[model samples]
Target: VNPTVFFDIAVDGEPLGRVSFELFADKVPKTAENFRALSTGEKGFGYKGSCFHRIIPGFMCQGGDFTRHNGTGGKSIYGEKFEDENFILKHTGPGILSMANAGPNTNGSQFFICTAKTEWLDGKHVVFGKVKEGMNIVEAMERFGSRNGKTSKKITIADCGQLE
Candidate 1:
């Protein structure tokens, strides 16, 4: 399994610095497939402008709405079957990426990278990847939004691709 994937996030053509995703291919194969599809554009579409509209301090951040351009409204995507959740990865700190779910076995493209420790999410969400760098940007974005969980500022997937 590949250990690294390239990610670039920007606001207006200004590169926010390149980061790597240390993907856990064995733990969450289906969710990883969904992530790879979005990253590599294999599904004929990607998360280029998708928004991370909800950010909660000390808990977690929420996004992955494929329908809405602003992340305010969208329907859930079909989730794959559950896999073994007892992997080495844990939602322990910032930059740890995990799948977002509507219910048991109902996960889709929605995912969030923790900005802080969130051990309560373990075993519930599938941990797929972790940010190798640029956590300051995530923290900044979380802080730039509205404090009531509805963020006025949105976090968009500027660019994502496989490492060559």
Candidate 2:
């Protein structure tokens, strides 16, 4: 079975809910493992306390820049960045979790969860997983965001971990 992970959420320091995700480790092992370990924080640093720096309604909500924590900086477990795994999994629908990058082979700790069917990002991004639950909070974040990708309320990952 594919490994499942979870993110305890909050908005402006207030509790929201949990969003559980099922990573496609069977297809993209390397990329999937990155998300897993980061959630577990086995390396001492990961997505905990990281806020979604960018949020766009009908698009996606982006986060995971634990270093700078403002959409500016984040590094991977491998290094500062890692190469693109594969574009085999396309962003065909909402709730798809994909890596965010500057251009190419520049994937860091940053990632985004689609709030809409953003197929335009299909070839450019690596889709590693999907939301197994908590779609409501995902949409809530979108409603709280502006077109310029800023949220009216701070959306954050209060905690994250791999599920046994």
Candidate 3:
């Protein structure tokens, strides 16, 4: 069994807040492992210093493209793309952390956090984690920074690792 993990997020190189998540390892083992490995830097890669490349108010804030900086390049800790594991999880509310994919089973490192209910995205992306705290910061990111797939302030994942 894999332990739960948490990521401490920063914005514009400042300590904004932290978000803890639990992996649905039973339902999406591979997908969850990909995220876990990436987040912990266990595979020589992680979400640190990545920017929130896309921000859609009332929708989601997307990031984790550590390689490209743009929303186009990112790979799993396995060194390649992997299949999707979209299960019973629904993108029904804010702070729902989900994978950002181009299409079906194309999940990479990019992910998004919902700022509002995005029911339309249900079954399209895999909901791997949820924000356990610091939702105010998430709302602040949505309210102040998001602009045209870029933010006025740089939002970065300063550090990420296993919680316990």
Query: Tens digits of per-residue lDDT for model 1 on 32-94?
Result: 666766777666666666666678765566766766654434332233334434445788888
Candidate closer to the true structure by TM-score (higher is better), 1 or 2: 2
Pairs that clash in candidate 1: none
**Overall lDDT per candidate, in order of appearance:** 0.66, 0.91, 0.79
Write model 2 residue lDDT over 1-164, tens digit each, in one string: 89999999999899999999999999989899999999999998999999999998888999999998788899889999898999999988889999999998999899999988898898899999999999997877788888999889888999999885
lDDT (tens digit, per residue) of candidate 3 on 84-112: 76557898798887888888878889888
Q: List RMSD in Å for every model shown.
A: 3.2, 0.8, 1.8
Off by over 4 Å in 1: 12-17, 69-88
Name the runs in model 2 displaced over 4 angstroms: none
List clash counts for every candidate, in order.
0, 0, 0
Choose the strongest candidate by lDDT: 2
